[PDB]
A paper describes a structure:
Chronic wasting disease (CWD) is an incurable, fatal infectious prion disease that is found in cervid species including deer, elk, moose, and reindeer. Here we report a 2.8 Å cryo-EM structure of CWD prion fibrils from brain tissue of a naturally infected white-tailed deer (Odocoileus virginianus). Like recently solved rodent-adapted scrapie prion fibrils, our atomic model of CWD fibrils contains single stacks of PrP molecules forming parallel in-register intermolecular β-sheets and intervening loops comprising major N- and C-terminal lobes within the fibril cross-section. However, CWD fibrils from a natural cervid host differ markedly from the rodent structures in many other features, including a ~ 180° twist in the relative orientation of the lobes.
Using helical reconstruction, we obtained an overall resolution of 2.8 Å for the CWD fibril core. We used the final reconstructed 3D density map to build an atomic model of the CWD fibril using the PrP polypeptide sequence of residues 92–229, a span of residues consistent with the known protease-resistant core of the CWD prion. As with the structures of the known rodent-adapted prions, the CWD fibril cross-section comprised a single PrP molecule with major N- and C-terminal lobes (called N- and C-lobes, respectively). We have defined major motifs comprising the N-lobe as the E motif (in reference to its shape), hammer loop (also shape), and central strand, while the C-lobe contains the disulfide arch and C-arch. The N-lobe of the CWD fibril was quite distinct from those of the rodent-adapted prions, both in the complex convolutions of the polypeptide backbone and in the ~ 180° rotation relative to the C-lobe within the plane of each rung. The hammer loop was wide enough to create a pore along the axis of the fibril, with a 5.7 Å gap between the opposing sidechains of R139 and R151 in the model. The β-strands (β1 and β7) in the more C-terminal portion of the central strand were terminated by a salt bridge formed between residues D181 and K113 (the only buried lysine of the CLC). The individual rungs of the CWD fibril were not entirely coplanar, which created a staggered interface between the N- and C-lobes formed by residues 109–113 in the N-lobe, and 219–223 in the C-lobe. At its base, the CWD fibril contained a disulfide bond between C182 and C217, which was surrounded by a patch of hydrophobic residues. The overall shape and width of the CWD disulfide arch were most similar to that of the murine wild-type and anchorless (a) RML strains.
Author numbering:
A (entry chain B), B (entry chain D), C (entry chain A), D (entry chain C), E (entry chain E): 92 to 229
The structure:
Amino acid sequence: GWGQGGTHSQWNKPSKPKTNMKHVAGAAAAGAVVGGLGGYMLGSAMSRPLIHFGNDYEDRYYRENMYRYPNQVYYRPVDQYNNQNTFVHDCVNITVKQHTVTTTTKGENFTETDIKMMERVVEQMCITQYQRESQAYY
Amino acid sequence: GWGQGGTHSQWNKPSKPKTNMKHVAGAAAAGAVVGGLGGYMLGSAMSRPLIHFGNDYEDRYYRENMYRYPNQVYYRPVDQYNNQNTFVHDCVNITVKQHTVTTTTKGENFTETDIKMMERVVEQMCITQYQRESQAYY
Amino acid sequence: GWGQGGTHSQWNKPSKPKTNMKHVAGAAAAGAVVGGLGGYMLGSAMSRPLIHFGNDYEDRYYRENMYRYPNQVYYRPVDQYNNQNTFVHDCVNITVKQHTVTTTTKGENFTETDIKMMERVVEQMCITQYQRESQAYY
Amino acid sequence: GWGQGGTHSQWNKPSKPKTNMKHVAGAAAAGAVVGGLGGYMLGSAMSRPLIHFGNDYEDRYYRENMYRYPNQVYYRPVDQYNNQNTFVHDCVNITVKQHTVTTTTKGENFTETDIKMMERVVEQMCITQYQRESQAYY
Amino acid sequence: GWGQGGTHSQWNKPSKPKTNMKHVAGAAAAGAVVGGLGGYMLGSAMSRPLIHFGNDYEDRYYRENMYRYPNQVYYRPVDQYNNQNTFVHDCVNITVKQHTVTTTTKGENFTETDIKMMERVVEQMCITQYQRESQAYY
């Protein structure tokens, strides 16, 4: 007539995490867990992987049992070329340019005029602004 | 007549996570879990994978049982070329350009005029703005 | 008639984490856990991996049992070429340029004019601004 | 009729962590734990990895049991070329340039004019500003 | 009828950590723990790794048991070339330049004018400013 107390356990219990950041790449933030027996596991081999939050009871009576390589993980990869990649390209290769190429041969008594006005061409770009009861003036 | 207390357990229990960020690539954020016995697992082999939140009871009586390689994971990949990739291209290869090519040969007594006015051409671009009771003036 | 007290345990219990940062790459921040028996594990092999928050009871009676290599991890990878990478490119290769190429051969009595006005061309770019009851004037 | 007191234990219990930083690369900050039996483990092999927050009871009676290499980790990788990398490129290769190339051969009695006005071209860039009841004037 | 008192133990218990910093690379800060039996462990092999916050009870009666290499870690890596690196590039290769190349051959009675005005071209860049009831004037 024994007794085990109930388990109220948290692998991650962050209370009121107020966080301001920009980039979360390959990481964990704002009270987040990257995988329980998992996550980013490109090549894996797990024998008898068990997750049970409930109570566990085992009453085992093993007699003369021949266990030959139980839960064996024969991890023998050959020439494994696997790609599981995350690519994020934001505002890349942005160009605001004015280019002029001049190739004049034996130009006599000639006038060359090259005017490239560039005014108020881009006022805003990639403005990741979060506003809450706020004001922004540009 | 024993007793096991009930389990109230959370792998991730974030309370009121207030977070501001821009990019979450290949990561975990805002109280999120990347996989329980899973996630981003391109090549995997799991024998008897079990998840049960409920209570577990086992009363095993094994006698003279021959278990030959139980739950065996024969992980032998050969020439595995697999691709599971996430590609995000936002506002990439954006060009605002004025280009002029001049190739004049023995130009005599000639006038060349090249005017490229560029005014108020792009006022806003890629403006990821979140507004809540706020004001923005451009 | 014994008794084990209930377990209220947290692997990470941060209370009110107020944090300001910019980049979280391959790390942990704001009270976040990178993996419980997991995370970023590209090549892994785990035999009998078990996670159970509940109480555990075991009553084992093993007699004359032949256990030959139980829970064996035969980790023998050959020529494993795997890629699980996170790429974040934000505001990369941004160019605001004015380029002029002049190639004049035996130019006699000629006038060359190259004017490239560049005014108010980019006012803002990559402005990751978080506003809460605040004001910004540009 | 014995008794074990309940365990209320935290691997990391930071209370009210108020932190200001810029970059968290391959590290831990703001009360965050990088992995419990995990984290950033590219090549791993763990036999019988067990995590249980609940109480553990074991009543083992092993008699004449032949355990040949139990929980054996045969970690023999050959030519393992694996890449699990986090790449963050923010505001890289940003160029604001004015370039002129002049190549004149036997230019006689000619006038060359090269004007490149550059005014108010970029006012702000990569401004990671967090505002709370604050004001910014540019 | 014995008794063991409950354990209320913390591997890291920082109370109200108020911290201001810039870079946390490959380190620990703001009351953060880098791994419990983990962290940044590129190549690892652990036999029977166990973490249990709950109470542990063991009543073992082993008689005539042949344990041949139990929990053996055969750590024999050959030609292991693995990369798990964190790369953070912020505001790198930023160039604000005015370059002129002059190559004149036997230029007779010619006027060369090269004007490159550069005014108010970049007002702010990489301004990682955290504001709380504050004011900034530029």
